[PDB]
Amino acid sequence: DIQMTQSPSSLSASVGDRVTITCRTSENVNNCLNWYQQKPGKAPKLLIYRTSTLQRGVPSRFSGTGSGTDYTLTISSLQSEDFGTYYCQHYYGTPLTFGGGTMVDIKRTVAAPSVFIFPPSDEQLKSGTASVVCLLNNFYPREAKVQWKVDNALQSGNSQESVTEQDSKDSTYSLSSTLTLSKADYEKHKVYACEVTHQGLSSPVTKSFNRGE
Amino acid sequence: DIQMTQSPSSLSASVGDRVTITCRTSENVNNCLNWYQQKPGKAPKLLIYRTSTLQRGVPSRFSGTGSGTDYTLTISSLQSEDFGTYYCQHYYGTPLTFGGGTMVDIKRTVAAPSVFIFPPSDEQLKSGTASVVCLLNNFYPREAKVQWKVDNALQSGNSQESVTEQDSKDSTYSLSSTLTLSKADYEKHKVYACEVTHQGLSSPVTKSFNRGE
């Protein structure tokens, strides 16, 4: 029942920077500490075990040090493919415990999202369902909010979002929001709008279309 | 390990007839034999246990006898609600084994099925799915075969069937066969037919319709 605190909780640096992540345990874990890198949608990948031993196939720029209640993961030269959430984990007794995680990505200047809205196609409308797609293209940082409005009414519970991983070239993100309705519900409304808020925008951006126009 | 043979496999008698079902075992079962009644779509119901003892709530017209390898289930006066499949089961050691089962229903003259076909409704076609229904109404005996032909092509794996229990009045059965397609697959074909084979029909009967007519 050993508590584990990671610092920082979020981190952003440039390619080639030196990155240090600290893992503090409430009690001495006697070097029984492991480090993992998790990319979105994937299982955590083991980087370091037993404080300092690199796993097979892990690049040498990852190193681990520490003892007692103080442990450190170090990336000597940060690379583009090093984004994700890093976890420490102790195995000194039970229960096995993970740290809260530390999110890492490549730092760049703020880029506002470019917003596009797509009406459902006639082919899908024949199928009895209607999907309205809203695209937020090439923005940074990751934090973004998308709201759907059908005839100026805020929607809830009928949309899903998907985000791409941080691009290796421009270090931006892309996001798609899909509003799913039945054809009957889609046909009894006129205006379909997508409102986007992002710190790169001085004010929310709305893209809308009128059904059948 | 211990094999069990029931005789007969299928049985049809009139109301008030005396029905005798034989359960033969390959080895001595030592009177550790039970009898079950199973209605269609339901779990087996224990009728008699330990060769001869009736379960509470079982009418006295059911009786079980036998010893060694020969056992008998007797219905002194068959009633209409006695339809179903009857199983014997031994528990003299393991593995526990059941008999093959004996189907019982009320005897009557052969009745040919009245076949109807129903196209999918407009309300369902708007929803994006198409269900075509073929009805076999008031037939006897139970054995019947239904085949779906879409543009004269035999269909497989896209239909389900449901049967009513034997009617208390006329002792007939009714069956529905539902062919489920997507709206797209349904719209790319013209002729939809169900072909029915039954002993009451001198030749197979085909009911069909042309989509959009």
What distance in Å separates residue B126's CA from the closest CA in chain A? 6
CA atoms within 13 A on the CB side of B24: 6
B154 touches A at CB < 8 Å: no
**Taking a C-beta distance cutoff of 8 angstroms, is the pair B47, B60 a contact?**
no
**Taking a C-beta distance cutoff of 8 angstroms, is the pair B135, B176 a contact?**
yes
Cα torsion through B100, B105, B108, B113, rounded to 10:
-80
Pairing of strands A19-25, A4-7: antiparallel
Show residues of chain A in contact with B127, CB under 8 Å: 128, 182-183
- Asked if the Cβ–Cβ distance from B183 to A128 is below 8 Å, we say yes
What distance in Å separates residue B129's CA from the closest CA in chain A? 8
B8 touches A at CB < 8 Å: no
- Asked if the Cβ–Cβ distance from A126 to B128 is below 8 Å, we say yes
Resolution of this entry in Å? 2.5
What distance in Å separates residue A73's CA from the closest CA in chain B? 54
Amino acid identity at B197: T
What are the boundaries of each domain within chain B?
4-106, 114-210
| CATH for the stretch A4-106 | 2.60.40.10
**Taking a C-beta distance cutoff of 8 angstroms, is the pair B143, B156 a contact?**
no
- Asked if the Cβ–Cβ distance from B184 to A126 is below 8 Å, we say yes
User: CA-to-CA distance for A50 and A104, rounded, in angstroms?
Assistant: 23
User: CA-to-CA distance for B197 and B143, rounded, in angstroms?
Assistant: 9
Q: Which residue of A has its CA nearest to B186?
A: A127
**Taking a C-beta distance cutoff of 8 angstroms, is the pair A165, A83 a contact?**
yes
| Residues of B (121-140) whose Cβ lies below 8 Å from A | 126-129
Q: Which residues contact A41 (CB under 8 A, 6 or more apart)?
A: none
B136: left (phi over 0), alpha (psi -120 to 50) or beta: beta
Q: Which residue of A has its CA nearest to B185?
A: A127
Q: Does the fold of domain A114-210 match that of domain A4-106?
A: yes
- DSSP sequence for B120-185: PPHHHHHHTEEEEEEEEEEEBSS--EEEEEETTEE--SSEEEEEPPPPTTT--EEEEEEEEEEHHH
User: CA-to-CA distance for B115 and A124, rounded, in angstroms?
Assistant: 35
- Asked if the Cβ–Cβ distance from A183 to B126 is below 8 Å, we say yes
Q: Say whether A176 sits in a helix, a strand or coil.
A: strand
- Asked if the Cβ–Cβ distance from A183 to B129 is below 8 Å, we say no
Q: Which residues contact B194 (CB under 8 A, 6 or more apart)?
A: B115, B117, B132, B134, B146, B147, B148, B149, B177, B179, B206, B207, B208
User: CA-to-CA distance for B148 and B163, rounded, in angstroms?
Assistant: 17
Residue B74's closest CA among B23, B19, B129, B31?
B19
Q: Is A151 exposed, middle or buried (0-12, 13-18, 19+ CB in 10 A)?
A: exposed
Strand order in the sheet with B4-7: B4-7, B19-25, B70-75, B62-67
Count the helices and strands in chain B (H runs, E runs).
Answer: 2, 19
- Asked if the Cβ–Cβ distance from B183 to A126 is below 8 Å, we say yes
Query: For testing the chain B interface, which of A123, A125, A126, A188 should be mutated: the one with the most B CBs within 10 Å?
Result: A126
For residue B11, the 8-state DSSP code is E
Residue B199's closest CA among B102, B95, B87, B110?
B110
Residue B61's closest CA among B82, B92, B43?
B82
- DSSP sequence for A139-166: EBSS--EEEEEETTEE--SSEEEEEPPP
User: CA-to-CA distance for A107 and A47, rounded, in angstroms?
Assistant: 22
| CATH for the stretch A114-210 | 2.60.40.10
Query: Count of residues for chain A?
Result: 213
| Residues of A (171-200) whose Cβ lies below 8 Å from B | 182-184
Task: State the CB neighbour count (10 A cutoff) for residue B2.
Answer: 16
End-to-end CA distance of chain B: 60
Q: Which residues contact B66 (CB under 8 A, 6 or more apart)?
A: B23, B31, B33, B51, B72
